[PDB]
Amino acid sequence: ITGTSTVGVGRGVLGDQKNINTTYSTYYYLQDNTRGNGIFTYDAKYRTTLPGSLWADADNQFFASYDAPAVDAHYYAGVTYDYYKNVHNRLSYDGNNAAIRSSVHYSQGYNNAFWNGSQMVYGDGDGQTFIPLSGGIDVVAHELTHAVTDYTAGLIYQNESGAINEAISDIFGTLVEFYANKNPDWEIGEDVYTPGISGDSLRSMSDPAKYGDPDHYSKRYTGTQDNGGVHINSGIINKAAYLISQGGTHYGVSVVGIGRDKLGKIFYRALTQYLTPTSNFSQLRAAAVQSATDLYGSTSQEVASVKQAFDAVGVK
């Protein structure tokens, strides 16, 4: 819609207060005009027809219980856009400042979020397994990163390609969560998962086996469920990226970390220059060694830690 750019205030899913970019034309809309061609948050109104209706508000104040998931989807979309712009010089997910669209209140008691090929969508949860899923920044950045992957490497959402697709989204969702600060960790979804049960999360990168996910190639899932285990075998790659950033010993192999920023530089170069729709873990190993050599040199420390971490998770 067209109007004047303004700034509202609202409260997020976890009860914090934040400023959001809005647009005024009779109503205030959840339309951030400051970032590329815009950030648009919609109300799905407990249905599954998408996108629904652009979020309109009467007074530019977003403190209603109904408003909190919209506040966070709008806000964390903006933070993720700022991450990709300021750290990797990507203008939105296509590199050309595409519009970012999100719907909230999708369905009833819907315990997931996803990228549907065109927009993000967030359920409210059922209040015991999940609270509204946009409340977690690593969730929002994870889902947005599927769009980045679709537009670059194009990783097929199945078998090893899909575990890589999944692991990339976890990696950058965490890197965004660190970038914004606010209690960063190597866990996925701890902020919106199982209200009333502290300490847990959907997935762990530091130790994926805490939730039964493989942390080594020998332990890979080889069957039918979850599109060939794309949410399960991602633990193998998630552990490698953890080892690369923070270092550690894992199945006897010791790895020295090179920090968050360098994990980012190297994996972004892998995704946008070297990965193909059908890459598997071994090509992911080679792709990541090349970026390290590209950015740091044939005999860098960086090429060394990459090789080690993949040795540590058993990827040849």
Residues forming contacts to Na ion in the complex (CB under 5 A) are 18-19, 246, 298
Neighbour tally for 308: CB within 10 Å: 18
Smaller CB separation from Cl ion, 114 or 211 = 114
User: Among 156-164, 167-175, 192-200, 248-256, which window interacts with Zn ion (CB under 5 A)?
Assistant: 167-175
**Would you tell me which residues interact with Cl ion (CB under 5 A)?**
66, 114
Selected binder of Zn ion within 31, 145, 169, 291 (CB under 5 A): 169
On the 0-12 / 13-18 / 19+ scale of CB atoms within 10 A, 33 is: middle
From the list Ca ion, Na ion, Zn ion, none, partner contacted by residue 138 (C-beta under 5 to 8 A by kind): Ca ion
In the residue annotation, 302 being an active-site residue is answered as no
- CA–CA distance, 71 with 63 (Å, rounded to integer): 9
Which residue of the chain is nearest Zn ion when measured via CB?
169
Q: How far is the CB of 172 from Ca ion (least distance, A)?
A: 12
Single out the catalytic residue among 143, 160, 216, 250: 143
- CA–CA distance, 266 with 251 (Å, rounded to integer): 24
The 109-148 contact track toward Zn ion, x by CB under 5 A, reads ----------------------------------------
Q: Does 72 bind Ca ion (CB under 5 A)?
A: no
Q: Torsion angle of alpha carbons 272, 222, 215, 168, nearest 10°?
A: 20
Q: How far is the CB of 146 from Zn ion (least distance, A)?
A: 6
Within 197-256, the residues that bind Ca ion by CB under 5 A are 197, 200
**Is position 88 annotated in a ligand binding site?**
no
Strands 17-25 and 100-106: unpaired
Neighbour tally for 298: CB within 10 Å: 9
In the numeric block, which tokens belong to residue 64? Answer: 């209603």
Q: Torsion angle of alpha carbons 268, 260, 100, 51, nearest 10°?
A: 110
**Is position 177 annotated in a ligand binding site?**
yes
From the list Na ion, Zn ion, Ca ion, none, partner contacted by residue 298 (C-beta under 5 to 8 A by kind): Na ion
Contacting residues for 208 by C-beta, under 8 A, at least 6 apart: 214, 215, 235, 236, 238, 239
Question: Residue 254 in contact with residue 243, Cβ under 8 Å?
Answer: no
In the residue annotation, 216 being an active-site residue is answered as no
Smaller CB separation from Na ion, 222 or 298 = 298
For 256, which DSSP code?
A: -
Smaller CB separation from Na ion, 275 or 289 = 289
From the list Ca ion, Na ion, Cl ion, none, partner contacted by residue 19 (C-beta under 5 to 8 A by kind): Na ion
Site residues, Zn ion (CB under 5 A): 166, 169
Catalytic residues: 143, 231
